[PDB]
Amino acid sequence: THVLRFGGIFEYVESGPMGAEELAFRFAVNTINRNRTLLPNTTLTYDTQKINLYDSFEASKKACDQLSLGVAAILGPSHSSSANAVQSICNALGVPHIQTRWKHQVSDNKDSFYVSLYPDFSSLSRAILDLVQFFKWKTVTVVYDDSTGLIRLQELIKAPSRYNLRLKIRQLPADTKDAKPLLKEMKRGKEFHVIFDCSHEMAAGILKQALAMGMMTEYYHYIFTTLDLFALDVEPYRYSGVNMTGFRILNTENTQVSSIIEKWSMERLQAPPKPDSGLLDGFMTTDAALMYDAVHVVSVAVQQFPQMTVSSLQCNRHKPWRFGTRFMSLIKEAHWEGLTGRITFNKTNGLRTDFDLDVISLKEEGLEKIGTWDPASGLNMTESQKGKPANITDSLSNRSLIVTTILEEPYVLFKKSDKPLYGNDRFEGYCIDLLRELSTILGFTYEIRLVEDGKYGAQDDVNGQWNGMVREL
Amino acid sequence: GVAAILGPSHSSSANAVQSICNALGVPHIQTRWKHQVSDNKDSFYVSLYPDFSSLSRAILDLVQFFKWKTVTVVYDDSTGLIRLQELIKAPSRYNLRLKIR
Amino acid sequence: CGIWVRTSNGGHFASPNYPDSYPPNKECIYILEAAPRQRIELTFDERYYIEPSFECRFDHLEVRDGPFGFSPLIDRYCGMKSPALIRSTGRFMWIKFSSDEELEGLGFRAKYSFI
Ligand SMILES: *[C@@H]1O[C@H](CO)[C@@H](O[C@@H]2O[C@H](CO)[C@@H](O[C@@H]3O[C@H](CO)[C@@H](O)[C@H](O)[C@@H]3O)[C@H](O)[C@H]2NC(C)=O)[C@H](O)[C@H]1NC(C)=O
Ligand SMILES: *[C@@H]1O[C@H](CO)[C@@H](O)[C@H](O)[C@H]1NC(C)=O
Numbered sequence: 111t112h113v114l115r116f117g118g119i120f121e122y123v124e125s126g127p128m129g130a131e132e133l134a135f136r137f138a139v140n141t142i143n144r145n146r147t148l149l150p151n152t153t154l155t156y157d158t159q160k161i162n163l164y165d166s167f168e169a170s171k172k173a174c175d176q177l178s179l180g181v182a183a184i185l186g187p188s189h190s191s192s193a194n195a196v197q198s199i200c201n202a203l204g205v206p207h208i209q210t211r212w213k214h215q216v217s218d219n220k221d222s223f224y225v226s227l228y229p230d231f232s233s234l235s236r237a238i239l240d241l242v243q244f245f246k247w248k249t250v251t252v253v254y255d256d257s258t259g260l261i262r263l264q265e266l267i268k269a270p271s272r273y274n275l276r277l278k279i280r281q282l283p284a285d286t287k288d289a290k291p292l293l294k295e296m297k298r299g300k301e302f303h304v305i306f307d308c309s310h311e312m313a314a315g316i317l318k319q320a321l322a323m324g325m326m327t328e329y330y331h332y333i334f335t336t337l338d339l340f341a342l343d344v345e346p347y348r349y350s351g352v353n354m355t356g357f358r359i360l361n362t363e364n365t366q367v368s369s370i371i372e373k374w375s376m377e378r379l380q381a382p383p384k385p386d387s388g389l390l391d392g393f394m395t396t397d398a399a400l401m402y403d404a405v406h407v408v409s410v411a412v413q414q415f416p417q418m419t420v421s422s423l424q425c426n427r428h429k430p431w432r433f434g435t436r437f438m439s440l441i442k443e444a445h446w447e448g449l450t451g452r453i454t455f456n457k458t459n460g461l462r463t464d465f466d467l468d469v470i471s472l473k474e475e476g477l478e479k480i481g482t483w484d485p486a487s488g489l490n491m492t493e494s495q496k497g498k499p500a501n502i503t504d505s506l507s508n509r510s511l512i513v514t515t516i517l518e519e520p521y522v523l524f525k526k527s528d529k530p531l532y533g534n535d536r537f538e539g540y541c542i543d544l545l546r547e548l549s550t551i552l553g554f555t556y557e558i559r560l561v562e563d564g565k566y567g568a569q570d571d572v573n574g575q576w577n578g579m580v581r582e583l
Numbered sequence: 584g585v586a587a588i589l590g591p592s593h594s595s596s597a598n599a600v601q602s603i604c605n606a607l608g609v610p611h612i613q614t615r616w617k618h619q620v621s622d623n624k625d626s627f628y629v630s631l632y633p634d635f636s637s638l639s640r641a642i643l644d645l646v647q648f649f650k651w652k653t654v655t656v657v658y659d660d661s662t663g664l665i666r667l668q669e670l671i672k673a674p675s676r677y678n679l680r681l682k683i684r
Numbered sequence: 685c686g687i688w689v690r691t692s693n694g695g696h697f698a699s700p701n702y703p704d705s706y707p708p709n710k711e712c713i714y715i716l717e718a719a720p721r722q723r724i725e726l727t728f729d730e731r732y733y734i735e736p737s738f739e740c741r742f743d744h745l746e747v748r749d750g751p752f753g754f755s756p757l758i759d760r761y762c763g764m765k766s767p768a769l770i771r772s773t774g775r776f777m778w779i780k781f782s783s784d785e786e787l788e789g790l791g792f793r794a795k796y797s798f799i
């Protein structure tokens with residue numbers, strides 16, 4: 111039971127329940143000290159520091175404080191402002207640094223003692239590009255909230271150079287979370303295609319706005335680059351006709367995945383939820399999952415390095431540490447199957463960019479996997495039930511044809527009667543009698559209706575589109 | 584002990600010193616424009632640099648005077664887009680079918 | 685919807701439903717007729733003190749210096765600002781209140797004075 115310590119820091123509420131990242135951090139070490147599949151002769155202790163939000167100074171103090179105790183590898187907090195200094199300290203004293211959020215990568219930082227399990231936004235964005243290309247859209251529209259969003263989606267932003275696209279940009283107001291002005295601007299804009307970028311809380315809180323504005327109509331097809339799309343309580347929506355597509359790194363096919371899910375729920379829904387928020391309460395979150403999977407990867411790396419000790423490194427002693435040199439190597443070399451399956455590290459910059467994300471969509475029953483993807487082999491979408499479940503083209507033997515008309519004074523009239531009548535029998539005129547004769551001569555199953563256009567249907571030179579009869583046809 | 588500081592150029596070296604100074608009350612000067620984090624409570628810094636939330640507005644003005652209907656942006660490294668975001672949002676109202684390389 | 689406020693040295697004009705939200709889809713023309721030699725003093729009573737950062741469409745209140753939709757444009761106002769008071773000797777103010785298909789507001793309250 112080799113004693114060893116893991117630098118743990120967590121920007122924290124400074125009130126209320128335990129830190130989500132931190133509760134995950136404890137869960138993993140517990141599982142470590144139960145199962146002997148890992149570290150039979152090793153049992154891992156740890157140290158907890160909690161520092162303020164976005165306060166690099168305060169951070170560095172606690173970082174050094176733990177290095178006084180000595181640990182194996184600090185697990186820096188979720189924010190750039192602190193991440194950067196912690197990273198600098200970790201290499202300045204040679205100890206590995208593990209990270210869990212994408213941050214702004216500094217332009218030319220040469221230090222080489224850190225990784226970051228979160229998959230890079232460049233590659234994510236590239237997959238987004240592929241997916242958009244697959245639907246072959248023309249006028250997508252982007253919406254972020256923090257400027258840092260522009261930095262992440264750059265690879266999408268430059269795309270107007272190569273393919274044929276068109277792309278505005280709008281920014282959520284920083285405060286008031288009130289897209290009513292914004293969404294109204296979108297509705298008058300008629301921007302059917304939306305990408306989002308937001309912590310999924312805002313995603314849920316804005317979908318309700320969209321529904322209240324009545325945007326929820328089968329015409330729009332939302333896409334949410336935020337990864338934990340599966341936590342979304344999509345229930346009031348799955349009957350509205352839209353499709354939401356957002357990638358899931360957390361591979362849920364594994365049995366162990368779900369098992370750990372429910373146990374996490376037992377000790378996490380132990381922390382009471384927020385019923386308003388629109389979430390499947392008591393569920394994994396990508397960060398929490400990642401902070402978990404990181405513990406195993408560090409475990410693997412240490413599992414072959416028994417010569418580890420824990421030197422009480424003094425920051426103000428500016429000489430580095432010793433064992434990290436090959437230790438960081440081992441970590442970099444790791445390959446693992448955790449809650450998100452394959453995990454690797456690109457040697458070039460020590461950042462994970464190789465991975466297997468799983469496209470999903472709003473299934474009318476909920477949120478279900480409808481394909482996969484990777485950086486290497488591009489969109490591998492399983493075209494199943496595209497035209498037939500058997501995969502052989504077939505046509506419903508009985509007809510279910512619909513007919514759409516325009517009220518025309520001699521041709522199509524609403525059946526004038528004080529008492530109501532509905533179905534495909536509420537109309538009368540010339541075209542109605544003609545349709546009746548079509549039925550009498552061929553035995554149709556027609557349905558009569560109007561188009562919201564209610565005209566001949568017209569070419570839309572604003573986008574080359576058509577309207578009404580032409581669009582529906 | 585001092586009464587002021589003249590600080591560094593990178594983003595990194597900058598914000599660390601800024602956090603340190605505001606941790607003790609000491610004023611801090613800046614030159615290089617950098618990325619203000621949107622959720623920092625810090626108070627004890629200044630930066631003389633003509634801030635880009637204005638240069639962008641002005642560049643927009645100049646664009647409007649020259650009346651271009653197409654324009655292409657060319658930057659150098661990431662932080663450029665942050666610096667120019669007030670520009671990028673332009674097509675929301677006006678017609679500037681622009682690209683980016 | 686419109687209110688004849690003619691031949692009043694002063695009188696009160698406001699969005700229909702002034703205390704509550706103004707109605708949607710409303711297009712009501714409001715007419716100020718001042719006799720010759722009279723100077724028009726419009727007094728506008730704002731209901732809400734905050735500065736909008738955006739001048740957007742869907743909802744506008746027009747001011748015309750002479751017959752509406754026809755005469756020179758004075759301004760198109762929106763937001764939660766009270767517009768500054770308007771002094772013209774053109775003797776005719778021709779005002780329209782608009783409304784969009786959703787998202788109404790606190791309405792507006794106005795007063796007219798003639799000299
Ligand atoms: C301190 O800085 C803030 C942020 O720059 C100033 O507020 C104003 O913020 C808006 C943000 O869009 C700037 O854009 C302007 O908005 C107005 C109102 O819609 C518009 O009429 C302008 O054409 C422009 O789009 C605005 O420039 C900025 N105002 C400034 C710099 O005076 C805030 O006013 C600044 N305060 C001081 C004391 O300088
Ligand atoms: C959206 O989902 C529904 C149900 O699966 C489907 O019928 C429809 O074709 C999809 N596309 C859109 C955006 O309407």
Ligand SMILES: *[C@@H]1O[C@H](CO)[C@@H](O)[C@H](O)[C@H]1NC(C)=O
Pocket residue numbers: 456457458459463464
């Ligand atoms: C690693 O990073 C380089 C950066 O140039 C990139 O080209 C490459 O695709 C990445 N993936 C791997 C695993 O080589």
Ligand SMILES: *[C@@H]1O[C@H](CO)[C@@H](O)[C@H](O)[C@H]1NC(C)=O
Pocket residue numbers: 490491492493
């Ligand atoms: C995806 O990859 C598998 C690999 O077995 C291949 O069989 C399939 O044809 C590919 N394309 C689809 C339909 O997803």
